[PDB]
Design a protein around this ligand. Sequence first.
Ligand SMILES: *CC[C@H](OP(*)(=O)O)[C@H](O)COP(=O)(O)O
Ligand code: NA
Ligand code: NA
Length: 324
Amino acid sequence: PQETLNGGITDMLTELANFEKNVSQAIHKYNAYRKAASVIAKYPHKIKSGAEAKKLPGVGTKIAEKIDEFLATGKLRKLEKIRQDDTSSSINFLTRVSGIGPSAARKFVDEGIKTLEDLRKNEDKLNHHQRIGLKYFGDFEKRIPREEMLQMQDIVLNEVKKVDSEYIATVCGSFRRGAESSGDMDVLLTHPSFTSESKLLHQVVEQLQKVHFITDTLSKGETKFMGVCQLPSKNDEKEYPHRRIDIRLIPKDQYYCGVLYFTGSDIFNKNMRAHALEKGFTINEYTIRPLGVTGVAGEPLPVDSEKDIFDYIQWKYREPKDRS
DNA sequence: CCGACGGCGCATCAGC
DNA sequence: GCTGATGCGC
DNA sequence: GTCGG
Ligand SMILES: *CC[C@H](OP(*)(=O)O)[C@H](O)COP(=O)(O)O
Ligand code: NA
Ligand code: NA
């Protein structure tokens, strides 16, 4: 539906969501306002009253009253007052830096650090993650066109197999669901030597650094890498933006459940878990397990493919691109 | 009325 | 030195 | 902030 339908309302609710998350530190209100923004963005009518919006799930009495104020006045006094508070504005802005959440933003503004320039002058007060978030502030806010994601996928899948031909790597997220653009690249990796019962990530990260694909590290442990990458451009050509890449090393016996989980969408996964439950199975990120007659989860079932999960619960396979 | 609302993996701090 | 809490991103 | 036991 065209943004001109309810765009005023959905912008107001997104602004309130960001305020609750970044300033109030109220993650459950942030999610309530996001959920309300999302249901209203999908609604194929121009909302005429709060009462009409209130019929939608995730819209209750308070968001109805805000919509009535916005429809009558073209504004919300609560937001006009928030926009006049320079301290709220600074806290909200600093959370755009990866590694700066609501706590760090408030600590920074309370010691007079409010701008990107203030952060650059005070690098000693930033952790490693926040320094890299600052270094790539603009690039990290750019979307990744699908054509670039295809090129990135080709480097990652090929370089992983050069480390060891037995690795399996799958790019998940929006990209796997067939999105025309992505926020980041989320790679799930496994190897038959790694199961839930017994250097693998380090060697893959090392290879991707050696061919100058991975440029920086935000965090790295035994099973999760978060960092920065860049497509190679030909000499004299315009450089590609730096991109966020995550790499998750999953036990082989949990791998396809992970692929299903990190592919989504969220609504799809929720509908799939519910369907499994009525069929007598419980699905989480790691496993599919049969439920006994009193609701006790049994042993994990063997899963050798994503399709194996859909077969257990007798659902027809939804292609990754038919899950949003 | 009032608790749930995802929760893991990593970096870093608090406390011992 | 260690354990456990918190902040953070996804 | 909304939902639901
Ligand atoms: C927007 C109305 C609020 O809904 P939530 O419980 O955040 C409250 O009813 C009043 O909040 P105020 O806008 O701070 O007065
Ligand atoms: Na509603
Ligand atoms: Na941030």
